[PDB]
Design an enzyme around this catalytic site. Structure first.
Site, PDB file in Angstrom:
ATOM      1  N   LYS A   1       0.833  -1.209   0.000  1.00 11.30           N
ATOM      2  CA  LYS A   1       0.000   0.000   0.000  1.00 11.30           C
ATOM      3  C   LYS A   1       0.876   1.272   0.000  1.00 11.30           C
ATOM      4  O   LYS A   1       0.618   2.227  -0.719  1.00 11.30           O
ATOM      5  CB  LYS A   1      -0.971  -0.033   1.156  1.00 11.30           C
ATOM      6  CG  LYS A   1      -1.886   1.185   1.228  1.00 11.30           C
ATOM      7  CD  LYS A   1      -2.898   1.071   2.399  1.00 11.30           C
ATOM      8  CE  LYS A   1      -3.876   2.204   2.352  1.00 11.30           C
ATOM      9  NZ  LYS A   1      -4.885   2.055   3.412  1.00 11.30           N
TER      10      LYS A   1
ATOM     11  N   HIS B   1       2.763   6.033  -2.513  1.00 11.58           N
ATOM     12  CA  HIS B   1       3.820   7.006  -2.290  1.00 11.58           C
ATOM     13  C   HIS B   1       5.065   6.935  -3.156  1.00 11.58           C
ATOM     14  O   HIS B   1       5.895   7.835  -3.056  1.00 11.58           O
ATOM     15  CB  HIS B   1       4.237   7.019  -0.817  1.00 11.58           C
ATOM     16  CG  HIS B   1       3.121   7.343   0.116  1.00 11.58           C
ATOM     17  ND1 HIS B   1       2.457   8.550   0.073  1.00 11.58           N
ATOM     18  CD2 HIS B   1       2.493   6.598   1.051  1.00 11.58           C
ATOM     19  CE1 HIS B   1       1.489   8.541   0.989  1.00 11.58           C
ATOM     20  NE2 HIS B   1       1.479   7.352   1.584  1.00 11.58           N
TER      21      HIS B   1
ATOM     22  N   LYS C   1      -8.971  10.975  -2.354  1.00 11.08           N
ATOM     23  CA  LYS C   1      -8.072  11.018  -1.214  1.00 11.08           C
ATOM     24  C   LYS C   1      -7.610  12.494  -1.073  1.00 11.08           C
ATOM     25  O   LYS C   1      -7.166  13.084  -2.066  1.00 11.08           O
ATOM     26  CB  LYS C   1      -6.889  10.103  -1.444  1.00 11.08           C
ATOM     27  CG  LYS C   1      -5.962  10.019  -0.220  1.00 11.08           C
ATOM     28  CD  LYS C   1      -4.820   9.033  -0.409  1.00 11.08           C
ATOM     29  CE  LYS C   1      -4.052   8.795   0.886  1.00 11.08           C
ATOM     30  NZ  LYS C   1      -2.718   9.466   1.063  1.00 11.08           N
ATOM     31  N   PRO C   2      -7.777  13.101   0.120  1.00  9.90           N
ATOM     32  CA  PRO C   2      -7.560  14.544   0.177  1.00  9.90           C
ATOM     33  C   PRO C   2      -6.122  15.010  -0.035  1.00  9.90           C
ATOM     34  O   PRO C   2      -5.914  16.039  -0.682  1.00  9.90           O
ATOM     35  CB  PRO C   2      -8.056  14.937   1.578  1.00  9.90           C
ATOM     36  CG  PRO C   2      -8.833  13.821   2.093  1.00  9.90           C
ATOM     37  CD  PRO C   2      -8.407  12.589   1.349  1.00  9.90           C
TER      38      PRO C   2
ATOM     39  N   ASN D   1      -1.895  13.541  -0.576  1.00 10.82           N
ATOM     40  CA  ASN D   1      -1.003  12.406  -0.839  1.00 10.82           C
ATOM     41  C   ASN D   1       0.312  12.855  -1.407  1.00 10.82           C
ATOM     42  O   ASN D   1       0.312  13.639  -2.352  1.00 10.82           O
ATOM     43  CB  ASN D   1      -1.674  11.461  -1.824  1.00 10.82           C
ATOM     44  CG  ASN D   1      -0.948  10.145  -1.920  1.00 10.82           C
ATOM     45  OD1 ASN D   1      -0.987   9.344  -0.948  1.00 10.82           O
ATOM     46  ND2 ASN D   1      -0.257   9.937  -3.006  1.00 10.82           N
ATOM     47  N   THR D   2       1.413  12.351  -0.887  1.00 13.84           N
ATOM     48  CA  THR D   2       2.754  12.716  -1.349  1.00 13.84           C
ATOM     49  C   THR D   2       3.362  11.551  -2.150  1.00 13.84           C
ATOM     50  O   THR D   2       3.331  10.395  -1.707  1.00 13.84           O
ATOM     51  CB  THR D   2       3.665  13.059  -0.158  1.00 13.84           C
ATOM     52  OG1 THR D   2       3.071  14.100   0.603  1.00 13.84           O
ATOM     53  CG2 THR D   2       5.033  13.461  -0.627  1.00 13.84           C
TER      54      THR D   2
ATOM     55  N   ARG E   1      -2.788  17.770  -3.332  1.00 14.94           N
ATOM     56  CA  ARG E   1      -3.879  18.099  -2.405  1.00 14.94           C
ATOM     57  C   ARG E   1      -5.091  18.562  -3.171  1.00 14.94           C
ATOM     58  O   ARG E   1      -4.976  19.312  -4.138  1.00 14.94           O
ATOM     59  CB  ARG E   1      -3.452  19.219  -1.454  1.00 14.94           C
ATOM     60  CG  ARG E   1      -2.387  18.798  -0.488  1.00 14.94           C
ATOM     61  CD  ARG E   1      -2.278  19.777   0.657  1.00 14.94           C
ATOM     62  NE  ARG E   1      -1.480  19.196   1.706  1.00 14.94           N
ATOM     63  CZ  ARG E   1      -1.771  19.129   2.986  1.00 14.94           C
ATOM     64  NH1 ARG E   1      -2.899  19.591   3.457  1.00 14.94           N
ATOM     65  NH2 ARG E   1      -0.871  18.597   3.793  1.00 14.94           N
TER      66      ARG E   1
ATOM     67  N   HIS F   1       4.062   3.822   6.323  1.00 13.57           N
ATOM     68  CA  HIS F   1       3.264   5.053   6.307  1.00 13.57           C
ATOM     69  C   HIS F   1       4.157   6.209   5.968  1.00 13.57           C
ATOM     70  O   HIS F   1       5.329   6.217   6.328  1.00 13.57           O
ATOM     71  CB  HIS F   1       2.621   5.353   7.647  1.00 13.57           C
ATOM     72  CG  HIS F   1       1.637   4.362   8.104  1.00 13.57           C
ATOM     73  ND1 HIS F   1       1.771   3.685   9.300  1.00 13.57           N
ATOM     74  CD2 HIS F   1       0.474   3.955   7.550  1.00 13.57           C
ATOM     75  CE1 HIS F   1       0.728   2.880   9.458  1.00 13.57           C
ATOM     76  NE2 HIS F   1      -0.069   3.018   8.404  1.00 13.57           N
ATOM     77  N   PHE F   2       3.606   7.193   5.269  1.00 23.36           N
ATOM     78  CA  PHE F   2       4.283   8.442   4.999  1.00 23.36           C
ATOM     79  C   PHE F   2       3.817   9.442   6.036  1.00 23.36           C
ATOM     80  O   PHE F   2       2.642   9.813   6.073  1.00 23.36           O
ATOM     81  CB  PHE F   2       3.991   8.939   3.587  1.00 23.36           C
ATOM     82  CG  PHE F   2       4.868  10.090   3.176  1.00 23.36           C
ATOM     83  CD1 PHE F   2       4.496  11.400   3.467  1.00 23.36           C
ATOM     84  CD2 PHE F   2       6.068   9.866   2.524  1.00 23.36           C
ATOM     85  CE1 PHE F   2       5.331  12.452   3.103  1.00 23.36           C
ATOM     86  CE2 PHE F   2       6.896  10.921   2.156  1.00 23.36           C
ATOM     87  CZ  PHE F   2       6.532  12.192   2.453  1.00 23.36           C
ATOM     88  N   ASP F   3       4.706   9.842   6.946  1.00 23.97           N
ATOM     89  CA  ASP F   3       4.266  10.706   8.051  1.00 23.97           C
ATOM     90  C   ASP F   3       4.302  12.178   7.676  1.00 23.97           C
ATOM     91  O   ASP F   3       3.326  12.905   7.952  1.00 23.97           O
ATOM     92  CB  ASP F   3       5.151  10.450   9.294  1.00 23.97           C
ATOM     93  CG  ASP F   3       4.504  10.928  10.586  1.00 23.97           C
ATOM     94  OD1 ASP F   3       3.348  10.491  10.816  1.00 23.97           O
ATOM     95  OD2 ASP F   3       5.131  11.712  11.352  1.00 23.97           O
TER      96      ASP F   3
HETATM   97 CL   LIG Z   1       0.781  11.736   2.258  1.00 26.30          CL
END
Ligand SMILES: [Cl-]
Length: 124
Positions: free
Chosen positions: A7, A12, A41-42, A44-45, A85, A119-121
């Site tokens: 995922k 990412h 999705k609001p 995402n990087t 975004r 996860h991307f923090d």
């Molecule tokens: Cl993100």
């Protein structure tokens, strides 16, 4: 069910480009990575480095995650990233994103054996 590591990769990683080359990058990538299927999705990087370089962050600087967990790592180097975004014109099913390219350190949460990003923090 998708694995956590898989995922992370889907959401990412974009190693195929050095940087976002236009304002439409995010619209295209959000759609193709299946991040607009049932809702937009609001935020995402995407990271424009090799998978190996991003995986390597899990043995770099250990830092707190925003949520207070202790399995976050900050890259020693800046990396090419694009933040996507949603804009005010965005309305599912016609999602719309702003694309912002930058070179910044990344912070990822790592888990598992192998110990890999899940996860991307944040970026800094
Ligand atoms: Cl993100």
């Amino acid at each position: 069910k998708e694995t956590a590591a898989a995922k992370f990769e889907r959401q990412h990683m974009d190693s195929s480009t050095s940087a976002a080359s236009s304002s439409n990058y995010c619209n295209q990538m959000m759609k193709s990575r299946n991040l607009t299927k049932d809702r937009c999705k609001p935020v995402n990087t995407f990271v424009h480095e090799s998978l190996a370089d991003v995986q390597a962050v899990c043995s770099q600087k250990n830092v707190a995650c925003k949520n207070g967990q202790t399995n976050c790592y900050q890259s020693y180097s800046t990396m090419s990233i694009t933040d996507c975004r949603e804009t005010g014109s965005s309305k599912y099913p016609n999602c719309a994103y702003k694309t912002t390219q930058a070179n910044k350190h990344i912070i990822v949460a790592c888990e598992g054996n192998p110990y890999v990003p899940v996860h991307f923090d944040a970026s800094v």
